[PDB]
Amino acid sequence: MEAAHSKSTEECLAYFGVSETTGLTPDQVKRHLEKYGHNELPAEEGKSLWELVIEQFEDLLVRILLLAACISFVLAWFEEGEETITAFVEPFVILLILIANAIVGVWQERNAENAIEALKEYEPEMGKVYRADRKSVQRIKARDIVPGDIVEVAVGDKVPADIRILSIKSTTLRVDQSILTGESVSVIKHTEPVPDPRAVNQDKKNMLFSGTNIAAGKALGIVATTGVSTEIGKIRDQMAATEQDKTPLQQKLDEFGEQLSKVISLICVAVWLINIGHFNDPVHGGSWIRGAIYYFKIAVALAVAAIPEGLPAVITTCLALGTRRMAKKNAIVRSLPSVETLGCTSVICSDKTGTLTTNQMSVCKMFIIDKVDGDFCSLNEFSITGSTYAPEGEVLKNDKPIRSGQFDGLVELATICALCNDSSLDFNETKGVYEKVGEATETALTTLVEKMNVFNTEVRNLSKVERANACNSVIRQLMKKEFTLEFSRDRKSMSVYCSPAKSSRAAVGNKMFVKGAPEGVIDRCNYVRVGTTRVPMTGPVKEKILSVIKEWGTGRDTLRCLALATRDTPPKREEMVLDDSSRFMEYETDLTFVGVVGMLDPPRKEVMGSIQLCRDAGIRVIMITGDNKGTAIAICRRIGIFGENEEVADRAYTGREFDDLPLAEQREACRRACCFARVEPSHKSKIVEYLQSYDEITAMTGDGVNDAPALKKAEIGIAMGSGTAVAKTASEMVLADDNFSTIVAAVEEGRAIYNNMKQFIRYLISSNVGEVVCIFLTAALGLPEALIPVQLLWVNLVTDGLPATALGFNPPDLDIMDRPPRSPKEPLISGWLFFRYMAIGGYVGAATVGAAAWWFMYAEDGPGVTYHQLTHFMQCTEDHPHFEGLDCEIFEAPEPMTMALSVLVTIEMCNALNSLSENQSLMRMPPWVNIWLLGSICLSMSLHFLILYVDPLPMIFKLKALDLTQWLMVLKISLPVIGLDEILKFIARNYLEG
Ligand SMILES: C/C=C(/C)C(=O)O[C@H]1C(C)=C2[C@H]([C@@H]1OC(=O)CCCCCCC)[C@@](C)(OC(C)=O)C[C@H](OC(=O)CCC)[C@@]1(O)[C@H]2OC(=O)[C@@]1(C)O
Ligand code: NA
């Protein structure tokens, strides 16, 4: 299981000690199969519904909630009185809620899918090998392939493993390594070894990656590595090894629950200490046996009171809606909880070409040599119009149109652009648009020749589906394409060997047309063509050439330049090994510079603006390209990552420079850096790591399995709509339009969603605070139960839910993008706000209790002991004479309850309004600022007037309320809250922190 790409063919055959013509012997197979194991990625482990549900009941609360769902049940039986056949509702409801929860988490999860599973889609079921127990190729199962045996792949096949190529049978071999990088452009493979043992896959020309597809040809190879040890296997490992933290909100709730618990227990502790007098004053009797059940049915109350039962639903329905929302804006957010984190993204690393630019090339300038005489040198710049690959456009000199043909240098420049190009143009009808075909930069070059027919061929008479490849075809018919030497990142260029067609252009017979990066070719040039003639390349002419090269690429034009040359006296055909991409740069020498061309990959409109929004938003933006550092920087300025006259030395690094740094300075570079030039393998991931050490919520883009490990690591991995499937599944969000702007657009929606989300949370949590107080007092004052869990529930699930989810639609602040990203470690409720709900809660806690204790004391329906003795209501049936003289069951009356509850409701529809803004007054932030909020409050109210007047329902708790005096009471009890808040809100002035 090697690094075969650097070893020779005999060396790999040697290593495994196998025969290219025989293959592994069954012994070797078992031996290998044992040592190396099977050729597959570890199985997927998805817990069962049992394992699910269990987890669904691991949340401290859901547990505490369930423990109480029992006590209620245990208490609901030991009732002993038949006239209580509704004692099972309380327990039944709880379990339903609990259940309903698990019902979701189990369905929700089961539908989501990991990327480590998507990877097993690239694993072909079958493979073709050659083993010693037969002469013809045996077609076995990938699973059983082994490191060392001889394999054969061909045109249609999915490469089953990391294979070193032994020999290519077909005249050529092409592979679609797109599932790795995303680009579908097939690549040519060879046999000769690659020296560098630390080489990037991109430069492993003699290797076949498990997962990729044979584009063209047929070849035979020896399996270097299998299973997890394969390029894709490694990635699976990384992605498995990566742990993704919990959304800060889930972090915050998990905390809330932890504490919510500690308090609850403490309350009990205190409650017990409040009634510790039942040790010194109580005597032996049968009365206390009925006091236990009290301390128990008071706990289950204490629970539903504490926990914000409805919250989970409100949230998930909010995020749900925001999702669908963002979707309309092209942001496909997979995984709801991310809508939160998305909103706090500190830094955004975006690939350039796909998203920041349009990836739509077009040549804007060209320049041939005009004259070289002495030290005097003169070029011949031009300008080409037309952004679309459309053949529609004009060449100009100093803005004045020109006939390309009137220049020699140009006709060659054109032929090269036409012959040394593997791309083409096509005109579809489905949308009458001129579409690219091959490589984006070449399909441009072709377009360039259509725009400058060096031969003036008549075309205006041709149809568009012909105007496509006209001027191009003519040049193709003036030279024969013997063959072409492909691009290789070492010599960074390419060429095509050609011969003329008959004696029509037998001028000098065989020619070699080469295109590539300027630096490279220009050195391999010993001559420069001054239009139809040649002169010894010299110092000046060179400086001049390069100078314009820097202006065009570093200047505001920010163009990519391709030097163009031709080898006039190419080596003889037979003297060239056309299958050892090493002697290519060699074959491409003693060249004659004919001209350079410049093209542009136009930034996107919204981009310039989006980049600005981020500045306002305090969100850092980092560009990641393939451009040479020089143009990388230029492009950053052009869009605003940098300022035209800003220093950058320490803010832009090239893939290599970054490596040349020590782990330390490597970390610094990241907090400051805003541009990464020619980034290699790891980098994206390594970069996300550092950004996180500085505790920054970071966004990352990418689209090939090559980027999956980074997309998974980043807080918000961003995949392209046009991206691969593995990328997408590895990401949190997917830009349906690959637009960088769609990213920002989202980050904004995120900040808006959370702000509202943030409030409707405090709203409900604050109520739960008061609810608990009411339950405490009720207990500390011995007073009869002012509120029942069943009621409490309904309140928290419906009467409080509706307005809460309405609050979700609170209008958005106008400076959401003018404030720095929010801090993950920011508490939802603290300091003065803690104090407010501390009070508001206390308010309702008293308010409610008293309204029940009012219907008892000082009321005109059921007058109880106004001397306050009502407190000992437990003592009544037996203690009938001792200070009673009346019916013993008024305490069990319903209206005193419907009171405490009606005040609750109203106070809640009130508090729900004190929520439209954290520190603004309602006279500044009127309640109608959210029509929904109001509309819902109404709906909640009519529902309340439904658990009273309907029939079955009223029995399930309470009775009714006297239109006035009783309802009027409710009002002179609740309404005051608004003032209490407004007053405390007003404290936003007696301290300026509005
Ligand atoms: C739900 C009801 C209650 C009564 C509760 O115990 O909530 C506490 C609690 C656990 C927190 C507190 C509650 O503290 C109290 O209300 C004081 C105790 C009085 C009761 C004693 C009766 C004799 C929150 C509710 O309220 C106020 C206003 O004081 C605010 C906040 O919660 C949030 O930001 C919500 C998190 C989503 C948390 O301080 C939180 O602790 C944390 O870690 C946070 C950051 O979570
Ligand atoms: Na992620």
Ligand 1: centre distance to CA 775 (Å): 16
Helical ranges in 827-930 per DSSP H:
831-856, 895-911
Of 201, 232, 225, 296, the C-alpha closest to 16 is 225
Handedness of CA 548, 553, 559, 562 (dihedral sign): positive
Q: Please say whether the beta carbons of 960 and 966 come within 8 A.
A: no
DSSP per-residue string spanning 633-658: HHHHHHHTSS-TT---GGGEE-HHHH
Beta bridge partners of 80: none
Please indicate whether residue 838, judged by its CB atom, sits closer than 6 Å to ligand 1: yes
Given ligand 1 and candidates 268, 314, 829, 915, which is best to mutate, with the most ligand atoms within 8 Å of its CB? 829
Burial class (CB in 10 A: 0-12, 13-18, 19+), 968: exposed
Please indicate whether residue 260, judged by its CB atom, sits closer than 6 Å to ligand 1: yes
833 CA closest ligand 1 atom index? 28
Residue 850 structure tokens: 């008293």
H or E element at residue 164: strand 162-168
Compute the distance between CA of residue 295 and CA of residue 412 in angstroms, rounded to an integer.
97
To the question of whether residue 496 is assigned a binding role by annotation, the answer is no
Q: Please say whether the beta carbons of 423 and 469 come within 8 A.
A: no
In this structure, the chain runs to a length of 994
Q: Are strands 213-216 and 174-176 parallel, antiparallel or unpaired?
A: antiparallel
Compute the distance between CA of residue 455 and CA of residue 403 in angstroms, rounded to an integer.
9
Rg of the chain over Cα atoms, rounded to whole angstroms, equals 38
Secondary structure class of 167 (helix, strand, coil): strand
To the question of whether residue 402 is assigned a binding role by annotation, the answer is no
Compute the distance between CA of residue 808 and CA of residue 761 in angstroms, rounded to an integer.
10
Secondary structure class of 698 (helix, strand, coil): strand
| Ligand 1 atom 8: residue of nearest CA | 260
Tally: H helices and E strands in the chain = 36, 32
Cα-Cα-Cα-Cα torsion 293, 296, 298, 304, nearest 10 degrees, comes to -140
Residue 977 structure tokens: 């809250």
Of 672, 639, 669, the C-alpha closest to 656 is 669
To the question of whether residue 985 is assigned a binding role by annotation, the answer is no
Please indicate whether residue 626, judged by its CB atom, sits closer than 6 Å to ligand 1: no
Please indicate whether residue 267, judged by its CB atom, sits closer than 6 Å to ligand 1: yes
Backbone angles phi, psi at 795, to 5 degrees: -55, -55
Secondary structure class of 529 (helix, strand, coil): strand
**If you search the block for the tokens 């401290």, which residue do you land on?**
60
Ligand 2: centre distance to CA 113 (Å): 14
Instruction: List b or e across 142-178, with b for residues whose CB sees 16 or more CB atoms inside 10 angstroms.
Output: bebbbbbbbbbbeeebbbbbbbbbbebeeebbbbbbb
Handedness of CA 922, 928, 932, 934 (dihedral sign): positive
Beta bridge partners of 763: none
Please indicate whether residue 837, judged by its CB atom, sits closer than 6 Å to ligand 1: yes
Compute the distance between CA of residue 927 and CA of residue 890 in angstroms, rounded to an integer.
40
DSSP per-residue string spanning 290-346: GTHHHHHHTHHHHHHHHS-TTHHHHHHHHHHHHHHHHHHTTEEE-STTHHHHHHT--
Contacts (Cβ under 8 Å, ≥6 apart) of 246: 254
| Ligand 1 atom 40: residue of nearest CA | 256
Closest ligand, as measured to the CA of 253: 1
Beta bridge partners of 513: 496, 566
Beta bridge partners of 718: 701, 733
76 DSSP 8-state letter? T
Secondary structure class of 528 (helix, strand, coil): strand
Residue of 351, 707, 738, 981 with catalytic role: 351
Inter-axis angle of helices 299-306 and 60-75, nearest 10:
150
To the question of whether residue 307 is assigned a binding role by annotation, the answer is yes
Contacts (Cβ under 8 Å, ≥6 apart) of 28: 16, 17, 18, 148, 149
Q: Please say whether the beta carbons of 309 and 797 come within 8 A.
A: yes
Q: Please say whether the beta carbons of 669 and 653 come within 8 A.
A: yes
143 DSSP 8-state letter? G
3-state helix, strand, coil in the chain (%, to 5): 45, 15, 40
Of 97, 15, 21, the C-alpha closest to 56 is 97
Of 866, 701, 867, 874, the C-alpha closest to 350 is 701
Amino acid identity for residue 189 in this structure: K
Does residue 351 carry a catalytic annotation? yes
Secondary structure class of 239 (helix, strand, coil): helix
Q: Please say whether the beta carbons of 211 and 158 come within 8 A.
A: yes
Amino acid identity for residue 352 in this structure: K
Ligand 1: centre distance to CA 295 (Å): 23
Amino acid identity for residue 613 in this structure: L
Please indicate whether residue 761, judged by its CB atom, sits closer than 6 Å to ligand 1: yes
DSSP per-residue string spanning 49-81: HHHHHHHHTTSHHHHHHHHHHHHHHHHTTTT--
Resolution in A: 3.1
Please indicate whether residue 763, judged by its CB atom, sits closer than 6 Å to ligand 1: no
Work out the number of other CB atoms within 10 angstroms of the CB of residue 543.
11
Q: Please say whether the beta carbons of 37 and 226 come within 8 A.
A: yes
User: How far does CA 399 lie from the centroid of its chain?
Assistant: 45
Residues of the chain with a following break (C to N over 2.5 Å): none
**If you search the block for the tokens 């025969």, which residue do you land on?**
19
Compute the distance between CA of residue 180 and CA of residue 516 in angstroms, rounded to an integer.
24
To the question of whether residue 58 is assigned a binding role by annotation, the answer is no
Secondary structure class of 395 (helix, strand, coil): strand
602 DSSP 8-state letter? P
CA angle, 134 then 138 then 139, to 5°: 170
Beta bridge partners of 131: 24
Of 299, 293, 306, 307, the C-alpha closest to 271 is 299
Closest ligand, as measured to the CA of 302: 1
Of 307, 327, 459, 461, the C-alpha closest to 391 is 459
Residue 199 structure tokens: 């080489």
Compute the distance between CA of residue 585 and CA of residue 567 in angstroms, rounded to an integer.
12
Beta bridge partners of 350: 623
Q: Are strands 620-624 and 347-351 parallel, antiparallel or unpaired?
A: parallel
Domains of the chain, each with CATH number or no CATH: 12-54+113-240 (2.70.150.10), 55-112+241-345+746-994 (1.20.1110.10), 346-358+603-745 (3.40.50.1000), 359-602 (3.40.1110.10)
255 CA closest ligand 1 atom index? 43
Of 559, 553, 565, 550, the C-alpha closest to 369 is 565
Helical ranges in 471-538 per DSSP H:
471-476, 518-523
Long-range contacts of 396-402 (CB under 8 A, 24+ apart): none
Secondary structure class of 452 (helix, strand, coil): coil
Burial class (CB in 10 A: 0-12, 13-18, 19+), 273: exposed
Full strand arrangement of the beta sheet holding 213-216: 187-188, 174-176, 213-216
Amino acid identity for residue 392 in this structure: E
Determine if residue 679 is left, alpha or beta; phi over 0 gives left, psi from -120 to 50 gives alpha, anything else beta.
beta
Compute the distance between CA of residue 166 and CA of residue 18 in angstroms, rounded to an integer.
12
Given ligand 1 and candidates 247, 268, 761, 769, which is best to mutate, with the most ligand atoms within 8 Å of its CB? 769
Beta bridge partners of 483: 497
Secondary structure class of 181 (helix, strand, coil): helix
To the question of whether residue 304 is assigned a binding role by annotation, the answer is yes
DSSP per-residue string spanning 862-880: S---TTTGGGGTTS-SSS-
Amino acid identity for residue 241 in this structure: A
Of 939, 932, 975, 507, the C-alpha closest to 760 is 932
Inter-axis angle of helices 831-856 and 976-986, nearest 10:
160
Compute the distance between CA of residue 290 and CA of residue 150 in angstroms, rounded to an integer.
84
Of 7, 796, 734, the C-alpha closest to 329 is 734
H or E element at residue 351: strand 347-351
Secondary structure class of 499 (helix, strand, coil): strand
Q: Are strands 675-676 and 698-701 parallel, antiparallel or unpaired?
A: unpaired
